[PDB]
Amino acid sequence: TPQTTDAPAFPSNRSCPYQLPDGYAQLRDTPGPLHRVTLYDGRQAWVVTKHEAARKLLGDPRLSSNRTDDNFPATSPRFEAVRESPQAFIGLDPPEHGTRRRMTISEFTVKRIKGMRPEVEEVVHGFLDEMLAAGPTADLVSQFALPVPSMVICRLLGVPYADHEFFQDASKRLVQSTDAQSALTARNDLAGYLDGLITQFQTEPGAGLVGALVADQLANGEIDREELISTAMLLLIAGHETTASMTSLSVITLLDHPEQYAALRADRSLVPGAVEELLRYLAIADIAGGRVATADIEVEGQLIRAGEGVIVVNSIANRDGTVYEDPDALDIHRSARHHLAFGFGVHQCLGQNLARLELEVILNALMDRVPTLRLAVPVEQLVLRPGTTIQGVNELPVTWHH
Ligand code: HEM
Numbered sequence: 001t002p003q004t005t006d007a008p009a010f011p012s013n014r015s016c017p018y019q020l021p022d023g024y025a026q027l028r029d030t031p032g033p034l035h036r037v038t039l040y041d042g043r044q045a046w047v048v049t050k051h052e053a054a055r056k057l058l059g060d061p062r063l064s065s066n067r068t069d070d071n072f073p074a075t076s077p078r079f080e081a082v083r084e085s086p087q088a089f090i091g092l093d094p095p096e097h098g099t100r101r102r103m104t105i106s107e108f109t110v111k112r113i114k115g116m117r118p119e120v121e122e123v124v125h126g127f128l129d130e131m132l133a134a135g136p137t138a139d140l141v142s143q144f145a146l147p148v149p150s151m152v153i154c155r156l157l158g159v160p161y162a163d164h165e166f167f168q169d170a171s172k173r174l175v176q177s178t179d180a181q182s183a184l185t186a187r188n189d190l191a192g193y194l195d196g197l198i199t200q201f202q203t204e205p206g207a208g209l210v211g212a213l214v215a216d217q218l219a220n221g222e223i224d225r226e227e228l229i230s231t232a233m234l235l236l237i238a239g240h241e242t243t244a245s246m247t248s249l250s251v252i253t254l255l256d257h258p259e260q261y262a263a264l265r266a267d268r269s270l271v272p273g274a275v276e277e278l279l280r281y282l283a284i285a286d287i288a289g290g291r292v293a294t295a296d297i298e299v300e301g302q303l304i305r306a307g308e309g310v311i312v313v314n315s316i317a318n319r320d321g322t323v324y325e326d327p328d329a330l331d332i333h334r335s336a337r338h339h340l341a342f343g344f345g346v347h348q349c350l351g352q353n354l355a356r357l358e359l360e361v362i363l364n365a366l367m368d369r370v371p372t373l374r375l376a377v378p379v380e381q382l383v384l385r386p387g388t389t390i391q392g393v394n395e396l397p398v399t400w401h402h
């Protein structure tokens with residue numbers, strides 16, 4: 001009996017850190033905005049696989065971001081045991097989404113990000129000082145990719161970096177949890193820690209976004225204490241797992257495309273466009289694409305019914321050849337404008353301009369200070385995270401001329 005299905009298992013796992021999974025190239029090539037898939041629990045959902053349709057559906061308020069909905073298209077059991085906790089604004093819809101998001105936007109403006117350049121540059125070069133002084137070989141993830149954005153986001157939040165061993169471990173356990181119990185434990189660890197931080201700010205008002213939320217909105221009853229915890233937790237985790245993943249994956253990708261990496265080193269004005277192309281090409285955050293319909297939506301002759309889960313797969317939409325000519329070619333010189341790596345619409349990544357600053361500083365610093373950087377193992381020996389979490393590698397052995 002043939003095993004062919006019209007609802008393939010989703011998500012798929014990468015076999016090469018920067019290439020579309022084989023099942024995804026098939027979804028990309030099949031006409032139409034939507035395709036049926038089967039999720040880990042056997043439930044069918046839709047995936048959005050085309051670029052303009054993805055923008056349309058991310059902008060449609062009939063596609064709710066509410067994870068507590070029984071029909072939300074969960075791709076693993078990660079959140080099934082944490083539903084008794086309030087959602088951060090990533091899981092809220094208007095009007096609640098905006099009231100919560102607006103409590104945080106002041107920390108992420110273009111002006112604030114510009115003012116953060118000296119701090120980001122100091123942090124990047126400090127961790128490089130230490131890594132290069134110890135000599136090769138090193139794990140780029142633990143020694144550079146993770147600590148840099150962790151220190152930066154901690155200062156933005158008012159989270160003391162002295163606790164980094166504890167919160168970096170809990171963050172990893174939650175983001176990469178494979179069972180509901182391990183996710184619950186990691187989330188509880190972070191929640192109790194952040195709750196104590198709130199009490200400390202109530203005793204001694206202090207700097208950072210958490211301190212600002214405690215002194216203002218919490219003291220006015222405009223955010224619940226547990227919502228503050230969830231918001232701080234989202235910003236802490238997103239603030240260091242996403243950039244760390246982009247750093248390690250960009251290094252792997254650039255070293256696999258040496259002609260472009262050399263062109264990048266010779267003309268640093270190409271760095272901002274290279275970062276956009278790497279964001280498009282590596283598209284690390286498909287796990288942020290889930291939505292649930294609260295009303296019927298007709299999409300080019302296909303019908304999303306109320307109550308159906310829909311996943312906007314931005315990595316596949318970013319390989320739409322009607323937008324990016326030869327979409328599977330890495331080209332740091334191409335226009336990667338309009339990519340969906342950060343989403344689109346009211347939920348478009350709050351941290352996107354901090355991420356862009358960090359990646360530009362990081363790439364320029366690696367080229368300046370470690371021009372002989374190379375991988376210490378073959379690419380095929382790296383262990384890639386599965387499609388049920390943020391894409392990337394947990395370890396990246398590197399060497400250089402000592
Ligand atoms: C480094 C590369 C990054 C990528 C690829 C990425 C990806 C994404 C995506 C695709 C979304 C959309 C979520 C949705 O539509 O449901 C999102 C939202 C969000 N991201 Fe980023 N992100 C990155 C960096 C960051 C950083 C550094 C922060 C800092 C805290 C951050 C904080 C957030 C927040 C708070 C949201 C929710 C926005 C909202 O719901 O209004 N992200 N991210």
Ligand SMILES: O=C(O)Cc1ccccc1Nc1c(Cl)cccc1Cl
Nearest residue numbers: 078174175234237238241242287288
């Ligand atoms: O959403 C998941 O399954 C993993 C997870 C856990 C805790 C906090 C955030 C995330 N995911 C996540 C991250 Cl780390 C960044 C941007 C968007 C999303 Cl959905």
